[PDB]
Design a protein around this nucleic acid. Sequence first.
RNA 1: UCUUGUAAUUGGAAUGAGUACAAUGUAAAUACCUUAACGAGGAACAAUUGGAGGGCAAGUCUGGUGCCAGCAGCCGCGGUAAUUCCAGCUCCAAUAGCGUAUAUUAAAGUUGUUGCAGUUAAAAAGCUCGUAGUUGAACUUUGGGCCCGGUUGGCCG
RNA 2: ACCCACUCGGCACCUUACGAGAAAUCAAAGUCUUUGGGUUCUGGGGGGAGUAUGGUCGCAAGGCUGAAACUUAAAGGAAUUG
Lengths: 29, 35, 131, 150, 217, 129, 144
Amino acid sequence: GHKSYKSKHASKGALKRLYKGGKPDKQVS
Amino acid sequence: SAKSFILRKKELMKRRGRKVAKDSKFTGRKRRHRF
Amino acid sequence: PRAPRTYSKTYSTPKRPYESSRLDAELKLAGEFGLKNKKEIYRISFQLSKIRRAARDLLTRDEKDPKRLFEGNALIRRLVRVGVLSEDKKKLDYVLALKVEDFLERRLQTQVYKLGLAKSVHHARVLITQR
Amino acid sequence: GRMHSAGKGISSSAIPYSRNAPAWFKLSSESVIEQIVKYARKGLTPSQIGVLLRDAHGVTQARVITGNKIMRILKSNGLAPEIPEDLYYLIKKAVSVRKHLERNRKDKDAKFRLILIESRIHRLARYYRTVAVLPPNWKYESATASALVN
Amino acid sequence: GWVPVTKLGRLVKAGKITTIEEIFLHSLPVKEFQIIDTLLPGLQDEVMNIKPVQKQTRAGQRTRFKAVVVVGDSNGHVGLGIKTAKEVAGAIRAGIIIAKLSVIPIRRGYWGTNLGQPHSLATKTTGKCGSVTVRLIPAPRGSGIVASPAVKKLLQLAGVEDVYTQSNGKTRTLENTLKAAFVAIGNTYGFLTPNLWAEQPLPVSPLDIYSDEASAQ
Amino acid sequence: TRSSVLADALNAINNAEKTGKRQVLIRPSSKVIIKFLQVMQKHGYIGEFEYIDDHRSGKIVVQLNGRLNKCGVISPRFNVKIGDIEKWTANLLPARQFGYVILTTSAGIMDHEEARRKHVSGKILGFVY
Amino acid sequence: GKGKPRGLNSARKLRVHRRNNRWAENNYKKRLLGTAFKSSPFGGSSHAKGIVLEKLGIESKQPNSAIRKCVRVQLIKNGKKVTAFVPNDGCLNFVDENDEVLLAGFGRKGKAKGDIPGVRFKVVKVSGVSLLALWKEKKEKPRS
RNA sequence: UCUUGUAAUUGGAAUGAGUACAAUGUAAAUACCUUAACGAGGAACAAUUGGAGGGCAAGUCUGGUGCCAGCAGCCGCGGUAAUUCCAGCUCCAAUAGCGUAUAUUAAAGUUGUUGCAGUUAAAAAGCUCGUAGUUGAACUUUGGGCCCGGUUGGCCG
RNA sequence: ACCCACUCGGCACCUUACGAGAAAUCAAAGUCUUUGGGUUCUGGGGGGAGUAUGGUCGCAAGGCUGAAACUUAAAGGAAUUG
């Protein structure tokens, strides 16, 4: 087999293989 | 599957070369019924 | 609002409580002196460590420093008068090589046994507590 | 290495271990001084004057023969220019590449080298107005430097 | 009865050399182990670890046993050996052979002043072999050996009494921990303390002056 | 660029000794390089050294003789209160008896055994053992 | 070298480089934001007391069973609902509905002696008595 | 011929937990200190809390319950994703203490100033310029001579 | 133009380990438990997640900056063996 690509956050090409297949925050005073 | 795990690692330390006690029929039992 | 009466612990449990070498070493001490619990060895090994630690920081200090001369001769006087050292080892380099059994030898129940009067080490203890 | 590139060349000149006037020269001391101020009156540049003595008149270097450097000789006799030697030449290069740059709009490489030259001007200028040679602002802007060179 | 087979066997058979200081000062390369049995007695022997390791073949399975043994008498002399043998009994015998062959002096010192039969190491010294670092720090009297039980047994065997032993890395490996400690106390003698700054009398390496009776028969 | 020239000399000595050289050329030369070497020489760690004087900054040839386990520089020169001398030598010397850490005091460049006899202190300069 | 400033007037960088990198911790970041006070079922508390609602058959498997199943309990202060853990069978007859148990964290686990995922709150006391003493026949639990 | 262990073998001594004249104590009491009198022969006057693949200290222990399309068939053996289902015996540690939960510290060099790491494991900006910031070559009284009075070891006592 | 010798500055190549590394391998990844030449950036187990939210630059496509709750005992990298 081949050595895989590695990154901490998934690459945009790899999200396209996956994905294609509001209340704002509050800081309490 | 607790008995399967306790035996599986035990002969591994034969090959690693350390002391380990020889077994009997308490190997995979709850030694203590709990609180 | 009265002043808080100061207190401090006089014993320290070991960091490694389960070692077969030391567990047999302390049990040997307990049987031959008749010690009720292992705190008695813990207490001696606490104050022995305090004596060695104090004398160790004096030895980093140079010669003829009056802090070393005053505190050092005070520590030699206190151990000899109790009896832990002999009269021929009155130097700071020998108090580092003290042993736990030296302190236990100077106890009362150990000393009353060495002076007759007991016929066994456990009889020495139970005689003393009966006043 | 270099200031603005990845070169690391060590070509230089080696001043000899003889701080005093070699024997075969023995011409004079004051005669080169009147030679120096004669060449400065022609309109020359203090590097060009020093290189032309040793190519022609055998002056090994003007620091040892005269006792003073060439800048201090010209300043004593009042022939010094307004801006110094090298700061003048940096502007003269920066003007010419900028005149080149307006002629060729799509020269991306001249645009980069102009940034390098103008950066090298500012670092030199901050040195001179620190040692109080220029007026204490002297404000190098792009347009007026064309007038400053001619 | 041991039959001498090397040149150094003739050196010890006539008994013209008795102390280990002469052979170790020039650091003579020693090939055989039998000259130390006939010269230095009292070597205490302790087997450290025995394990089976396997070798996969085309059809069958060939196994062997790897044993590590550390040997010292009681003081200043220690050796560690590595040996893989076909049987557990021969691994002990061949393990001691290579361990005694790898003997090295240990240079002791004092934590404080230089009085009364040195108890500890001289200098801070380290040893590393494959991401296992063992550091040894000298300790005063009564401090004992504060070390790993294998290293404590190794240091008890070498002849030291007062050692601090701080360690780094994934030191769960036993065969790397021992030889890292072995090369550390091996590095202690390689260190040059200024007490040895006086020039040596330059011995003549007496192998040559006794070569008339140490040559071939 | 060449920030500290004491780091250059002490590195050149340690690189030369480990590989078994007999002498090493040190450039540039300094007051602090010269006064460092004289403490190392007087304690027998290095041998004899000669100053080559061209007009620029000098060069030094140091005849090595072994018997030098390690020498090094401490950068930056930390302010050493006289009570922190003992805390320093525990960190960067092999034993307690031998080994010297070198201090710039107001009484000149000197080691630590000499400084505590004079009862002075200053900035740390380096170490030798 | 070593990738960090080292000169003698660089304490501002060394002080504020540490402050930003400390935010990539886990104990430090969880402490300063006070997530014990905002998200955890225990409001930073060691123990919590809660009303049991129902008991679940979260069993080891079907009939041939290693019986370790427990209940669904709502904490009384924040009103959050958590899953509990009771010890061995024979204590399920003690825990009826609405008993106001006092429960603590479970925490440590090995590869034996309780490997149930999704539970971290063992039940220490039921109806204000115990579970150790109630199992070992020291006392009795009053019925509601 | 002199030294230890064992026993439903045996013998007398000693003492405080308690009760309590009295006295001390205290503003008055309680309690401590002292003490006339009573007060030990084991189910008495009875110590618990945890733990046994390693950590790690401590089992080639026992009984019972439920299942096996497994061997054998008077009995049994083995398995049992029953993660041992329920009890007991034995052993180990601490000890009038012991366990659990949360928080924090050490272990820890996983906050790294001392003292981490970035080719391939988390991590070197796509590249260069550039202000604050940080850092910045060597160099200017070095050496020699004179005496003086000190604190340490000694040949000396 | 070519040959020989030297030198300065380059892109690289081969051998080796005085050293270094987990190993592949490295004249730098060396001169680091014997740890300090100067200085910038980045990282602190895996999913949730380059997601939510705010700000910003862009006509747009987008880019830059960028979390937490919760869950999990893994997640990896180097070389060989059947």
